[PDB]
Every structure is written in structure tokens, then in C-alpha cells.
Amino acid sequence: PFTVLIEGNIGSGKTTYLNHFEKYKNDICLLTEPVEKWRNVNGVNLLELMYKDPKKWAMPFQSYVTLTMLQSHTAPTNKKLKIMERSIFSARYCFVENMRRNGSLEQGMYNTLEEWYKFIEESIHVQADLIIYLRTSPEVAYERIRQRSEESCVPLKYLQELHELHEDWLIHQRRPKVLVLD
Amino acid sequence: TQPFTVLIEGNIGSGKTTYLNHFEKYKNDICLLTEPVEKWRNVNGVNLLELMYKDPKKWAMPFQSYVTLTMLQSHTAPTNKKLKIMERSIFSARYCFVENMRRNGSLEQGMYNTLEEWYKFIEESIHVQADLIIYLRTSPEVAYERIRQRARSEESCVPLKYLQELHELHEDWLIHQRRPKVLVLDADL
Ligand SMILES: Nc1ccn([C@@H]2O[C@H](CO)[C@@H](O)C2(F)F)c(=O)n1
Ligand SMILES: Nc1ccn([C@@H]2O[C@H](CO)[C@@H](O)C2(F)F)c(=O)n1
């Protein structure tokens, strides 16, 4: 099916934007970021644990993120258009890269996650037809986060870092059709 | 797309490498798959096996994640041969090795739960071919001696206690069963 990925920083407006599509649920496969799964891995909130102790929990959290995303990407649909919030690509190019850069993933941990990504991309073609990038400034992103969880103590520098990674990927073509919304 | 497949299972020091070498003269008809130790030793220059033995609380989860991946790659590896024989499996990883790291505290609940979600999704996504298991049944002490009598490597300091627990887990799975056809070989010889 035709596949659209909604990408953007934390606090870039994706959840509000996606709520619009909650009424097209019989023409469109609407796959919202599985944060509820991440908050409840048979009683364990991996999202909370990662934010609390990244050096310990970034690895298993991102591994579980990789799996949930992989599930969403490969889920069957009759609908002729699929819309997904985030992807295995942003997990890899932005989130995992940043955790490597900031030291939360030691080399062997980074390497394990990379081998999974390589294996997935060799075993299957993941459908990405269109990327919609909700582009924001880290300041704007920071303020959405504060005007509304586990993530509320993200520093601005962390948002700045995730911002440039999205810019590198989606504007400057430093990683592998992109529509840039404001 | 997979041939009749035999998995060779046993404790560390149960004689699996020696046993598997007997099938090398039959490589015309047998796809022979050694446990992917060489991969684990060199994950883009990182030895995950050594790191796991050095500090299991830190490295058990990424190590067993990569083990899963490499076993998956062996299970699914393409062959024209009539028979595939594999050293260990995604089953011993899950039911023995991960189970013991969970019990001894190297894997916390969330870490264990992540690996289990992977195993669940793998068994929903593919049928892993497993037609026969050959269990090399040894006593922990003989396994222990075997390890101590051979070249120094990452596992050379595994305690007898660790071996004893792995033994009971192999017994749970392959004898009591207890876990979801086994030929039992006396490998204490
Ligand atoms: N690959 C990913 C994807 C998402 N997240 C985090 O999940 C929360 C909800 O989007 C956000 O707090 C978050 F974006 F930071 C993450 O840490 N890594
Ligand atoms: N799932 C698995 C499979 C194997 N191993 C370990 O790998 C080494 C070589 O057999 C042995 O030291 C070993 F068997 F312990 C492991 O830790 N976890």
C-alpha cells in the first residue's frame, strides 16, 4: 500500500496533526507511534526507564522500539493508503545515532542495534513512499513539550541534537520523497 | 524452503564441536552450521562474547540480542543440501541461556521482557525448521573438566554453579519437557 511517514522532533506537533486523520479510519491505515506498548512491556515502562537511566536502558528500549516499528511497517492492510507516525528510519538515523553520540550507547550496544537494522533491510523492503517532515525549531519543540510525561525533562540541547539529525537526514540528504511542513 | 534440520544441543563443554566435526566428511549432503561464535567475537571490531563474560549485568542483553539475530540467520540460511545440521539454536538461547541470565540477575525484567517480545515476534513471523534435536547429555563436572582442559577463551572461568544451572535447564527442556523429538546421546564418554 502507499506509505506515508510522519517525522519530526519530540514536540513537533505530530500527535495533534495525526488526530485529524482519526476520522479517515476506513480509507486509511492510521499507525500512531506505539508509546503505550513502550510504557507497558508486560508491566515494565521502558520509556520511563530509558529517560531515567539512559546508559542502562537506551539499548533494550531502542531494540523494543525497533521491533514495534517493524511490526507497524509490516502489518497487513486492505486500505490503499498507510499513514505511520515515525519509522524504523528515524529510530536508526536520529534517535539511535544521537544516543551513540551522547555516550548512552557504548560501541558494542550501538553495533548490535545496527546489525538488526542491516538484517531487517536485507530481509524485507520497508515501504516508504512519502515522508512528511513537521519541521520546527528546538525552542518551539521545547515549548510544546512544556505546554502539555516521561519526556518532560528533556534538555533543550537534546532537542537541538535531534533537530540537526532530522535536518541532516531529511533536508541535507545525509541518510536515505520528502514534504516539509512548517 | 528449508531441508530436514538437526539441532545439536548441550551444555558448555558437552563435546558439541568434536561431535559436529564428524559430519565434515559428509558436506556433499550436509549443510553444517557451527555456532556463530566468530560473529559474536567480532561485531565490527567488538567482542560481545568477552564483554558478556566480563560484565554480564551490562552486556547480557545486547549479547543475547545479537545471539538471537545470528541464530535466526543460521536457521534461515539458504541451502541446496538434503540435510542441515546446526550447532545450537534460537530455542536453547531462549529456554536455557536467557532463562539462566534472568534467574541469576544479569537480565533485569525489562531486558528479559524485550528479548521475549523478539522471540514471540520471530515465532509468529517464521517457522524455524527443527526436525530433530541431538542432545549431548553430560554431567556438569565433566563439562567443567572439558572446559578447563582446553585452550583459554572467554568462557574459561565459567563456575561449576553456572554449568549446573545450564544443565538443569537443558534437562528441563529436553528431558522433562516442560518447554515447547529428542535423541539423547551419552556425552560423558
Ligand atoms: N526511536 C525513538 C522514538 C521515540 N522516542 C521517544 O518516544 C517519545 C514519544 O514520541 C518521545 O519522548 C521520544 F521521541 F523521545 C525515542 O526515544 N526513540
Ligand atoms: N544463547 C547462548 C549461546 C551460547 N552462549 C555461549 O557461547 C559460548 C560458545 O558456545 C559458550 O560459552 C556459551 F554457550 F556459554 C551463550 O552465552 N548464550
UniProtKB/Swiss-Prot annotation, chain B:
Q: What positions does the entry give for ATP binding?
A: 10-18
Q: How is its activity regulated?
A: Subject to feedback inhibition by dTTP.
State the species of origin: Drosophila melanogaster
GO CC terms of this entry:
cytoplasm; mitochondrion
Q: Which reaction does it catalyse?
A: a 2'-deoxyribonucleoside + ATP = a 2'-deoxyribonucleoside 5'-phosphate + ADP + H(+)
Task: Give the top-rank taxon of the lineage listed in the UniProt record for this protein.
Answer: Eukaryota
Give the protein's function.
Deoxyribonucleoside kinase that has a broad specificity phosphorylating thymidine, 2'-deoxyriboadenosine, 2'-deoxyribocytidine and 2'-deoxyriboguanosine. Specificity is higher for pyrimidine nucleosides. Several anti-viral and anti-cancer nucleoside analogs are also efficiently phosphorylated.
Could you name the active-site residues?
Answer: 87
Residues binding substrate are 35, 53, 64, 88, 155
Oxidoreductase as UniProt keyword: no
UniProt keyword list: ATP-binding, DNA synthesis, Kinase, Nucleotide-binding, Phosphoprotein, Transferase
Q: Which family does it belong to?
A: Belongs to the DCK/DGK family.
Q: Name one GO biological process term.
A: nucleoside salvage
Q: Which GO terms describe its molecular function?
A: ATP binding; cytidine kinase activity; deoxyadenosine kinase activity; deoxycytidine kinase activity; deoxyguanosine kinase activity; deoxynucleoside kinase activity; kinase activity; thymidine kinase activity
> Is Lyase there in the keyword field?
no
Q: Report the EC number(s), separated by commas if there are several.
A: 2.7.1.145
Record text on subunit structure and interactions: Monomer.
Quote the protein name from its UniProt record. Deoxynucleoside kinase
